[PDB]
Design a protein around this nucleic acid. Structure first.
Ligand SMILES: [Mg+2]
Ligand SMILES: [Mg+2]
Ligand SMILES: [Mg+2]
Ligand SMILES: [Mg+2]
Ligand SMILES: [Mg+2]
Ligand SMILES: [Mg+2]
Ligand SMILES: [Mg+2]
Ligand SMILES: [Mg+2]
Ligand SMILES: [Mg+2]
Lengths: 80, 127, 155, 60, 78, 202
RNA sequence: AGAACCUUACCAAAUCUUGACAUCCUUUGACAACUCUAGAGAUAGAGCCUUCCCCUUCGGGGGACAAAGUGACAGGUGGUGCAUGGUUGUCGUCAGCUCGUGUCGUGAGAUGUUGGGUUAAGUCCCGCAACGAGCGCAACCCUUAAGCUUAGUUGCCAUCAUUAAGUUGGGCACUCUAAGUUGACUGCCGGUGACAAACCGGAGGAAGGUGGGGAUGACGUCAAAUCAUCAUGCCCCUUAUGAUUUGGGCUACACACGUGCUACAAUGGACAAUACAAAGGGCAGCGAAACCGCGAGGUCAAGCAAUCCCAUAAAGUUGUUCUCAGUUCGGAUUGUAGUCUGCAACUCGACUACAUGAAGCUGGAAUCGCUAGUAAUCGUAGAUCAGCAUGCUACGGUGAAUACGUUC
């Protein structure tokens, strides 16, 4: 079915991935081991000061982590 | 018997194999001598073959990826040394006597914020 | 560097000419990061030596550096509470590196209207004397060799 | 004279592209964003103390 | 400068297209410095500036294709 | 020359965030929504020892958590005022589900309500050095291992301003590991403005 | 980190002064959401459905969309960073700065921080009225540098086979790969510094002696900067030092100086052919393929977040040609004829082909920037943004010369 997960923190998404593969593997389901898609950042380089004292700046990021999980056996014990 | 010689130089991977016979190097279903575009010194990546006391040991039919062209080159030079030492494990004490097998000294670096070319500073006027 | 002796570690092999001291003057004609236009011009300026000179450029080449080879340096030093010059003989690693600039700086000065022919008239006419750049090494060769002065100075 | 301007901007003076974008908790008309609708100094005290998501510091 | 109707402002057209009846001369009072010259223009002035000027500009048979009432300048130099 | 505020660096390795939710497109107006409601706690409760609120969103199931330290008077008469701002904040758009308080014993071991303990004194003109030094000395009779308090703007009835930091203990600012809890409070009465900063270790 | 109008605080013309705004006030129609009159517009008026909530048993919290004149008033991008809070620039990532007990001094004060040696370092040991502590440097944190688990669908294909190539199957799973782990530290090292830490050497981790970079900015100075981000003590404006449009301005000009770009040519130009990246964005946005245009583009139009799109990187290679010239160098300037964004491009954008083709021969006195993926070279992407950057912060490709020395 290939459910997708994406989250800001990085340990949270691995414990969620092992939660969903735990609730899938404890029932009969031939699920793949969870897939790391590359995790994308984006950059916010910004001026610190309030007036015109430029050429003194600092940057920010935010980093979305993207995993991937797919099941190929729709069973009644793996429904939701 | 030699396989899986990875090779890295400046953001340009290269994976190889080594087949016995004679020295015949080839990448990406086309030649080498008229692929490395300027690079008249094609022989100077074959130069570990020069210093391993034997030139025509094996054939390669190698693979390469990414980077520039000499950034895409010169890692084949690195990449056949790992599999070359995996062909016979004697050569670490006898290929690192010219110091050749592995060094990853340098890649490009960050443009420092409020500068122009990552070590250069803009010109300040006077006093 | 007040800390001492940054290492050298520079290497210079070559494809055909079998000489470390020929890949140096490919590294000084190469301006603006274009190594992809140097030996295309250099090796097309050495294969035109034997068509212009009498011989192959190999046995002319060590003569061509040999006659241009600078001898003496004048590194000024304010001695002991005074101020005038001193002759210094160059350590043998530095002297070729000082030496090779005078090929290329006068290569861009001989108006022959073809750089792979204008530059090669200073390897021809360099094994033979009174070239373009031999005039400067004889001008500075007698800078303090004849003008010998306080030669007990340190630096 | 800017609290009149915010009274203009959330209304509409009817042409297509006469509007512009202003800071949410502050009121600057320049260097604002569209990911946040904040602005370049008013973003910074709200990027600190953890209260906005996403934002680690720097230095990748 | 494109195709499709060189963009006379329409209220100016409302004034001129029925203003051209008699032999009277009361010209514009516009201060809309945007419109081009439709070819059916009668002898009249205009008032084309709004900071402080009503410069009466001639409608005389110039190159009428200009997309501007720009015969009235804005500032001085010396 | 500038000490940057130590909460800024110390997120993502030892202190987590304040808004756990994720968004994709609504992050503009949703980022206006939480930043709209995170003043109403400090205004409506009027600081019943309220440290800092917590947002999490779960797709039309919001959950917010106010620490606030002091139970009881935050709640109302057994459950009266809590639903009164459930109803009051539920008129924001369609929100305010499961607000809960988590009390704080060891009162003056946390930066905020210390800074409103000693901002609230000197705005009633309580002679700043006994304002600070007691809030210093209660820290290390309650087990703390570092506090630095500074008060800056125009102390006393003077006409030039000078900052008088009265620190002690151990208060590092170049180790990332420690949970340097920071606060700030700007409060002054009838003779200008004034700033107050408090760093607390542990 | 976007000036056509908007922005916009400036000024000129019309324009109201419980107000374009926020609060209550008394009864509640909602709309000016539409069609028309005038005007440039704000607005000035007429046609409205002149309604509606949420539940009472003829009834009120007043939610609407805001309506009536009041008062409490509101509004200030107006004065000042020498009344301030917050926030930065800097000396300078320099290696210093301070206490708490003592103890000398009538005391301002000093020891502790000094004298031996080492280190980038007040880092380190050996000494001694000092013994310790605290803020600093170091590690802790990101990024990169090589393996093993653990995963595999868009992730790669060789071992097999149809493959223009869709990587279609095989389900192959290793090879990068993409985010989660083992281990660098002066370690056993040879010296000899005489045991003082440490310093020059040899070994084997891919790895040098803080592996390479960032983020981190001590007490404090400069009454440095900001009331125009916001907050703000106090003084002024009070049918105008407020408010709303339209339309000018912020770009004007003999001039003076900063920064940036593109060039003066033949290791250069034109011309067709011809390979190899990283980092990014795109659900009314990115837009393919094939289509009509000299191009700027126009229509339609499937696929869509590693997979799909923008998106050909460019420099260089092989080859043709101009053959050393105010020139087949350069496009500065200047009219016609378009495209696109927009309600509109005159003041005041941008791009294309048609001719026009100026200045200029590597620049006086002087003056900067850089120590290995580094300066230089052509390029790639992004935010800001409808449209418009040579700036800006990010990313790869090609890649040298030089540092014996501390005298100035
Ligand atoms: Mg392998
Ligand atoms: Mg030294
Ligand atoms: Mg105001
Ligand atoms: Mg490291
Ligand atoms: Mg480092
Ligand atoms: Mg540090
Ligand atoms: Mg004011
Ligand atoms: Mg300006
Ligand atoms: Mg394409």
């Amino acid at each position: 079915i290939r459910i997708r997960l994406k989250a800001y923190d990085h340990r949270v998404i691995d414990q969620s991935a092992e939660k969903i593969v735990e609730t899938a593997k404890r029932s009969g389901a031939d699920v793949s081991g969870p897939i790391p898609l590359p995790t994308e950042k984006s950059v916010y380089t910004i001026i610190r000061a309030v007036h015109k004292y430029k050429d003194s700046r600092e940057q920010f990021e935010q980093r979305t982590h993207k995993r991937l999980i797919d099941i190929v056996n729709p069973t009644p014990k793996t429904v939701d | 018997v030699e396989y899986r010689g990875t090779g890295r130089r400046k953001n340009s991977v290269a994976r190889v194999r080594l087949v016995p016979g004679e020295g015949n190097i080839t990448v990406n279903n086309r030649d080498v001598r008229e692929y490395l575009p300027f690079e008249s010194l094609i022989l100077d990546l074959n130069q570990p073959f020069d210093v391993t006391e034997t030139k025509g040991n094996y054939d390669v039919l190698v693979n390469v990826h990414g980077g520039g062209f000499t950034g895409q080159a010169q890692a084949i030079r690195h990449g056949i040394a790992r599999a070359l030492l995996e062909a016979d494990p004697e050569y670490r004490g006898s290929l690192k006597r010219a110091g050749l097998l592995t060094r990853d000294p340098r890649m490009k670096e960050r443009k420092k914020p409020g500068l122009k070319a990552a070590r250069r500073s803009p010109q300040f006027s006077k006093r | 560097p007040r800390k001492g002796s940054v290492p050298k570690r520079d290497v210079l092999p070559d494809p055909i000419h079998n000489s470390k001291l020929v890949t140096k003057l490919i590294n000084k004609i190469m301006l603006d990061g274009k190594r992809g236009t140097a030996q295309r011009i250099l090796y097309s300026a050495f294969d035109l030596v034997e068509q212009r000179s009498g011989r192959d450029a190999l046995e002319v080449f060590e003569e061509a550096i040999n006659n241009i080879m600078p001898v003496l340096e004048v590194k000024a030093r304010r001695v002991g509470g005074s101020n005038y010059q001193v002759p210094v003989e160059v350590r043998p690693e530095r002297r070729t590196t000082l030496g090779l600039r005078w090929l290329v700086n006068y290569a861009r000065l001989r108006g022959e209207k073809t750089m792979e022919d204008r530059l090669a008239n200073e390897i021809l006419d360099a094994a033979n004397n009174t070239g373009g750049a031999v005039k400067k090494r004889e001008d500075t060769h007698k800078m303090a060799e004849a003008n010998k002065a306080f030669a007990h100075y340190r630096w | 004279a800017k609290t009149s301007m915010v009274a203009k901007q959330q209304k509409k003076q009817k042409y297509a592209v006469r509007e512009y974008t202003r800071c949410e908790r502050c009121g600057r008309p320049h260097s604002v964003y569209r990911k946040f609708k904040l602005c370049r100094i008013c973003f910074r005290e709200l990027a600190y103390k953890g209260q906005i998501p996403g934002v680690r510091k720097a230095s990748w | 400068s494109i195709k499709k109707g060189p963009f006379v402002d329409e209220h100016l057209m409302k004034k001129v297209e029925a203003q051209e009846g008699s032999e009277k001369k009361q010209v514009i009072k516009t201060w809309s410095r945007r419109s081009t010259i439709f070819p059916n223009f009668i002898g009249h002035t205009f008032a084309v500036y709004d900071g402080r000027k009503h410069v009466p500009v001639y409608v005389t048979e110039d190159m009428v294709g200009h997309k501007l009432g720009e015969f009235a300048p804005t500032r001085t130099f010396k | 020359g500038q000490k940057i505020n130590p909460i800024g660096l110390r997120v993502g390795i030892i202190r987590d965030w304040e808004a756990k939710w994720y968004a994709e497109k609504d992050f503009a107006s949703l980022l206006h929504e939480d930043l709209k409601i995170r003043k109403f706690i400090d205004n409506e409760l009027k600081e019943a020892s309220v440290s800092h609120v917590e947002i999490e969103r779960a797709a039309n199931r919001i959950n917010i958590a106010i620490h606030t330290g002091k139970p009881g008077m935050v709640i109302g008469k057994g459950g009266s005022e809590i639903e009164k701002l459930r109803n009051k904040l539920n008129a924001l758009t369609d929100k305010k589900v499961h607000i809960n308080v988590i009390e704080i014993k060891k009162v003056d071991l946390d930066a905020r309500l210390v800074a409103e303990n000693i901002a609230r004194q000197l705005e009633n003109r309580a002679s700043f050095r006994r304002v600070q030094k007691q809030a210093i000395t209660r820290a290390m009779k309650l087990g703390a291992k570092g506090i630095k308090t500074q008060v800056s703007g125009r102390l006393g009835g003077a006409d030039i301003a000078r900052a008088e930091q009265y620190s002690e203990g151990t208060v590092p600012l170049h180790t990332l590991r420690a949970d340097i809890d920071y606060a700030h409070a700007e409060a002054d009465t009838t003779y200008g403005k004034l700033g107050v900063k408090v760093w607390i270790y542990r």
